[PDB]
């Protein structure tokens, strides 16, 4: 038994990782094929941080400004695209690791690895969420841009973010493979700021049911609920509104313990009422959201 | 910024995984050049795990009852033996993708990544730390049994984990790459329970530094206690005594901060006595006990 939050094995993803410099900046590159993906503000000054002319500033750059370095290998650049908020750089060399991998872009509250990388060497993984505000909790240095994170599915790659800039409440955004970034931000050093957190509660019910499957019943009670009933009293503690569809993705949850979704709805709805009293579930103080539904099934189930 | 727990890239240990069936269990190997490591109990039935004779049983098997599988290649078995209660089986070829590594043994309180496997494929990675108890509270289900904990160091891979047993209270018991077993623990199917766990002190601390370097602040206060007055108020509530070697090592977290060790432990001790009731730091409910000074210093400064 036991419930961790575990990362995927970050192996195929740091046969991968390589350092793009170009300039004074140096940053980390997703080297997949003979394509090199980095953040597009790798081209910048920090005079141009503030209002960047993109494409003014590529083309004015030529495939000899940019250093790319796998291990003690440099890779010639001789070509270069950008692509929404990334820049790809097409070297001549196709990477002998590339794994089986595709592009995804996730919702909130999906989860993945993030293989935190600086000077193109990867130092650390951890797992996160996607938050409901379309930014994600990370821990990252200056250096640090150009991780990505991704899932492992069988032996395939999915890669969904790749890390852009840090806001200034500590938290990090970033965009998917293909240069779009998750929520309503920009790499342009004006002010950001990102909306208000909420709690993902379709993922704290599936945490509750992973409790229940490892024997941990104390917080369940007698009670039942309404859909419009639950939701308008997790608003009042910031939580995201259930759907149906969160009801029904976690239909196996409720038959593999035969506890009615909207049951487990008002055990959640009477932990927020009471806390936890000085007790723990599954070794934690707190109500955890960042195990999906899916996450729950695969390493408990 | 930001906190999370963090485990070391696991590819280097990715590569030495593999499969190793005797009869009916399946389990987990190492492979490092041309040696297998996997626990002795590979070798014992649902009787024969009740009260083991490890060397009779080693003894009436043979090279032909380990089937090692790495990937979708057999592995030729050419020779046994076993080392405490590590089974080393000696293959036909040498493991093209062994990094350079060493075997150590980690001390309660030390931290270390876990590579959990599942019939020899890597299924996810971990950060855990030694229990006082020599536990460790880890994910592990069925057929997890010979996966490896490790740090990495450089280029260097130091293997100090290998897991066989999961005891009654959910917790995880293990040994060395060379076959001692972490805390008074037996691979035999018998009544086995952990002591009484306790809280890494240390560990708190450098996890409150961490918190500070981060911004969160409001536990700090004015006061100071001594090492004396501490370990007092921590033996009440099973927290590990604070050594003189303890507060040398959270030097460079004081230093950076501005926060004296022994103040942090008189917030230590406010928040022992006074609880948190709710209230988070780093997100967290509860003190967290997981993260070295090491581990607070490598994620938070890059040192
Ligand atoms: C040259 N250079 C730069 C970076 C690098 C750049 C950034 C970064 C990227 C972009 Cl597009 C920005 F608009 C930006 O201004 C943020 C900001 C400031 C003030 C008001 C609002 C805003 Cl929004 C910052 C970064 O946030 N980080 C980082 C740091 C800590 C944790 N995580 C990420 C690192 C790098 O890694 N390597 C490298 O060579």
Request: aromatic share 10%; hydrophobic share 40%; with cysteine.
């Amino acid at each position: 038994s036991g419930f961790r939050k575990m990362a995927f094995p970050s192996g195929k993803v740091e046969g991968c990782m390589v350092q793009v410099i170009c300039g004074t900046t140096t940053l980390n590159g997703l080297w997949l094929d003979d394509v090199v993906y980095c953040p597009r503000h790798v081209i910048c000054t920090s005079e141009d941080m503030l209002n960047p002319n993109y494409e003014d500033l590529l083309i004015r750059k030529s495939n000899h400004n940019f250093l790319v370095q796998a291990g003690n290998v440099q890779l010639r650049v001789i070509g270069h695209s950008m692509q929404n908020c990334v820049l790809k750089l097409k070297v001549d060399t196709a990477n002998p690791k590339t794994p089986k991998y595709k592009f995804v872009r996730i919702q909130p509250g999906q989860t993945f690895s993030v293989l935190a990388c600086y000077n193109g060497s990867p130092s650390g993984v951890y797992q996160c969420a996607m938050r409901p505000n379309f930014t994600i909790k990370g821990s990252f240095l200056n250096g640090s841009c150009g991780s990505v994170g991704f899932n492992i599915d069988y032996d395939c790659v999915s890669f969904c973010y790749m890390h852009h800039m840090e806001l200034p409440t500590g938290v990090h955004a970033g965009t998917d493979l293909e240069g779009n970034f998750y929520g309503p931000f920009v790499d342009r050093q004006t002010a950001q700021a990102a909306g208000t957190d909420t709690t993902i509660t379709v993922n704290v019910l599936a945490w509750l049911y992973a409790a229940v499957i490892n024997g941990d019943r104390w917080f369940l009670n007698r009670f039942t609920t309404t859909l419009n009933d639950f939701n308008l009293v997790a608003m009042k503690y910031n939580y995201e509104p259930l759907t149906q569809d969160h009801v029904d993705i976690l239909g196996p949850l409720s038959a593999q313990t035969g506890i009615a979704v909207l049951d487990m709805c008002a055990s959640l709805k009477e932990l927020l009422q009471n806390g936890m009293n000085g007790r723990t579930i599954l070794g934690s103080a707190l109500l955890e959201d960042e195990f999906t539904p899916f996450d729950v099934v695969r390493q408990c189930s």
